[PDB]
Design a protein around this ligand. Sequence first.
Ligand code: ZN
Ligand code: ZN
Lengths: 215, 213
Amino acid sequence: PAPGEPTWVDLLTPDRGAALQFYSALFGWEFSTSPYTMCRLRGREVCSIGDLGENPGPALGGWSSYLSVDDADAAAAAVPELGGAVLLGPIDILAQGRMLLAGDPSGHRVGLWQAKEDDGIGAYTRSELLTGASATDGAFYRGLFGADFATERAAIRQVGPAAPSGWYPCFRAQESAVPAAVMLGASVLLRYDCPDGPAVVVSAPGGEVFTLLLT
Amino acid sequence: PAPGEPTWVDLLTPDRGAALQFYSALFGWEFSTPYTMCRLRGREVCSIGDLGENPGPALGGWSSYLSVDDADAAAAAVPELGGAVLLGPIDILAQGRMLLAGDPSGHRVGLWQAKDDGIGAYTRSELLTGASATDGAFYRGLFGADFATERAAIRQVGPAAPSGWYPCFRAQESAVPAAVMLGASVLLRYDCPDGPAVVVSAPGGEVFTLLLT
Ligand SMILES: [Zn+2]
Ligand SMILES: [Zn+2]
């Protein structure tokens, strides 16, 4: 796993049961019928879905993207020098690896995962950053991962002031998944083009946002 | 501000306009501006902001901030005391240094390293917990054996009661029916040395306490 490569996405939601119904109906994910649910397709783990804990107030579930780093401590030392912020960690994760949470110069949050060790419809293909400051953010991420970063797995897309911004997971899909998701109660926020096909940014009924990569 | 002193509260709500409506009708706050500063008698009481503006997992509700002299030392101490660091330490402009922590029971609290009295004023925050002794030990290692013993306080509650840190705003008895007719629901009434306390679930679902004095 190259540095900066998208390696995992995780959904934290205040209604996990509804999220499982929605994403199983949209992507066909399987989970056996615990604080989290592993989502599988074609015998492979795709992602996980977990609970936002009991809260005395409203709560907004969102997808959390993780990019690979070779050394979480070096990444933590570099983040502030590149104009970002360390929000949590570096922290060890039960021998899975070492995790840090980082903010880029614009305040977009991203997980950085130092691991101690599929493509096809419904698979997690990558995460993309939607940003109104692609030059500032881009310099940050290329200083952290290298000059090749965000050149054509991860990508950086320029968006206007009214679009969602931040890192969003991209799941492979057919054109027909768009009405499917709308019929399931999702709302399309934006349609843009990538080298490998159109992308549709979607707000799920729970309000979390993800991208359908139509290929 | 002594360590452990309640110094700030802030509301994150997905319907800020409704929150402004509700809290102005209940407390008389004035508001000015991504977030809204709430003022009373020319003094800032608290802030109200939008849950919607940022993406990712996000927890709405009222957040209480206790003062600390050293956010980095507090962060080092939290896990050793049986808690967890949830966010930070991070710098907040030149305003200060913040961390969010969970106590042994999982209750969330803000800790703020910094660089009003009257109806509607923010008086203090109180922790409602079913583990007042375990949690009390956590906070007393963080702030000293003095904390939560005869500004912040820790209340033992039963299994069905609300739990966590809640801000306490001074009010008259009449604020309770007022809040109810605005659509809130009372969760709990208990007694404090300085008067009764009424825990209220707002129409938006956030929870706060009315200190009737
Ligand atoms: Zn909270
Ligand atoms: Zn409300």
